[PDB]
Design a binder for this molecule. Structure first.
Ligand SMILES: [Li+]
Ligand SMILES: [Li+]
Lengths: 366, 370
């Protein structure tokens, strides 16, 4: 029986992975393993490992790794703690494949761990471009260390091939997180209001702003000063991720809460069912998260995308791109006030029927 | 003033980097820093960090990291110890540039540390192909996390560009290690004969067969049988480096020395200047060393490469590959006795020229081929 290990280091990536994990678990010919780490064990990010367990999954191996110091040197140390724990976790699990989604620093660490230990990596969401984050270069490094590739669009598949991956190892299966659109039940406004003790019947923005890590001196005051200028709208926040630079954003969020206690809801981390439900009923998805470029258009919610963290990803008409600039942000906010489904199944099929035990040779473009 | 930090994890890669380090040290507008780690602190290799200091360099930061173990799990642990140490080393050094060569796992670790910490990485020898366990993948991951790229040949530069690096960040400068050919004062036959008590004036082969770790059950019978048949030739060589199966070569050579004591010379470690001097006057370089695919061509000395340890390296006129097959080898030896792409050895100065005149503080945008 094939042991498919799924890596997860953040609530949001766990949300994207959910239906693959559920289907592997339900499949009698496959044994799900889970390696959970990074933000799932940090109290500052909600201790979201508890959500994995409550959803009915068994965490095969957990590795706590994040240092609390908010610095780039501490991020590198965290990656080192991660490698030290992954060494023993992968030794014990002995997975037949490790599924790795995305582009975060903990994903880079587990991928090179798996490579060194000859565990084949299946990589989801390669081939994409996010110029303003060091996730950009991480993503392509993870591609180069992975044996098989599940891309979300033909453009992205083509880039993975340009990177020198064999065409027969690259699969355009779509965006796995978008299977939630068909398979997950959404909560109503009344249910959200009871759950968060907050009136979701009043218009609101959903805001997620993460550190833009290639930006030298990030000052997020233009965003919060912009929000303070909008009247008769509530502000619902999720917390920034664990990249260096995030405590500055948390401070700004707490300050806004203190100034507007009845108009601000700070949620360390929504379950992705609740998250998608809150997103669906928002005036707009504000900030610089990838959900603004995927889930928000898919739910027909406008996106106010700020800065360069998402720069290079495919665009569409509902995306308002603006600089980290108070006047540009205010005006985009006002604009928003005034105006297929079987990816999991496809991935499992490929994994069941494809030999990707050995990294294929480099693919030169003739 | 600009702080150029050079990373080194092995004696061999230090030797390749040597003349770039000398030139940075000599240059009054460049401050050399050195981050030494990994195999330089291993007792089985004789603590080669001391060679760096004796060669006249100052080690700015040292990071012990390698675990005493042969497991792949312990390699991953070693890499984690490396990252923990590199975090504080880079924090203290405040390099304007980190120079990183090749594809070892400690080089992957320091490159991602520098990426996260916004230290621009200059990568040497990207775009090359050599199938080991995973050495190829690592090399390309390092490329993707580096800001500027110093390739040894045009085909390698073209592959780096295919990997999505901007053409204006990729430079064919040749192989830095070949600066040793251009800058060495070679020992003469007489000086070599006196130093090693052996007559170099008579024809000889310099072989270098390293323990080909991939070819397990390593039977070098067609290797040495292929040399006892060649008449009127002496056999000179150093020791094969420490891999999984060097004692099968330590004795396969010692076999031939007790058999032909005044026809075979076994050598300590030459050191680069004496090595190139011995190489320069050899009939041909045989074996599977990387020397065979760069240093011997640069000295107009024919090469007979054995096995596939050097597979993927660019071939040219001077080179003739053979199987580990007794007959195919001898045919190469016998009238190999009849007889530019990696540059001539000015690579260090080309690199420094580019570094002084190019802005590479940020990673350039991904380059889509049209
Ligand atoms: Li299953
Ligand atoms: Li200097």
């Amino acid at each position: 029986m094939k042991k498919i290990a799924v890596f997860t280091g953040t609530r949001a990536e766990y949300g994207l992975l959910y239906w693959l994990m559920r289907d592997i678990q339900q499949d009698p010919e496959l044994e799900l393993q889970i390696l959970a780490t990074a933000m799932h064990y940090s109290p500052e990010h909600g201790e979201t490992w508890k959500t994995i367990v409550k959803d009915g999954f068994e965490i095969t191996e957990s590795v706590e790794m994040l240092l609390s110091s908010d610095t780039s040197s501490a991020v590198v140390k965290s990656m080192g703690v991660g490698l030290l724990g992954f060494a023993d976790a992968l030794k014990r699990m002995q997975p037949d494949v490790l599924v790795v989604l995305g582009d975060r620093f903990e994903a880079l660490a587990v991928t090179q761990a798996a490579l060194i230990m000859h565990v084949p990596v299946a990589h989801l969401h390669g081939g994409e471009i996010t110029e303003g984050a060091y996730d950009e270069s991480i993503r392509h490094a993870i591609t180069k260390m992975s044996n098989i590739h599940f891309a979300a669009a033909e453009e992205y598949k083509k880039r993975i091939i340009q990177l020198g991956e064999q065409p027969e190892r690259v699969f355009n299966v779509g965006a796995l997180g978008l299977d939630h659109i068909q398979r997950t039940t959404f909560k109503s406004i009344s249910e959200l209001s009871e759950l968060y003790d907050f009136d979701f019947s009043k218009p609101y923005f959903l805001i997620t702003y993460h550190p833009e890590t290639n930006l030298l001196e990030e000052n997020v005051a233009p965003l919060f000063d912009a929000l303070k200028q909008i009247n008769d709208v509530n502000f619902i926040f999720s917390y920034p991720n664990a990249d260096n630079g995030n405590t500055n954003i948390v401070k700004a969020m707490l300050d806004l809460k203190a100034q507007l206690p009845d108009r601000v809801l700070l949620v360390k981390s929504f379950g992705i069912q609740n998250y998608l439900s809150v997103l669906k009923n928002a005036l707009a998805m504000v900030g610089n998260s990838s959900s603004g470029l995927s889930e928000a258009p898919a739910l027909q919610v406008p996106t106010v995308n700020i800065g360069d963290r998402q720069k290079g990803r495919l665009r569409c008409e509902s995306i308002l791109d603006v600089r980290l600039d108070e006047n540009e942000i205010v005006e985009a906010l006002q604009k928003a006030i005034n105006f297929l489904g079987n990816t999991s199944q496809k991935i499992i099929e490929v994994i069941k029927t494809t030999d990707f035990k050995k990294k294929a040779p480099f693919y030169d473009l003739l």
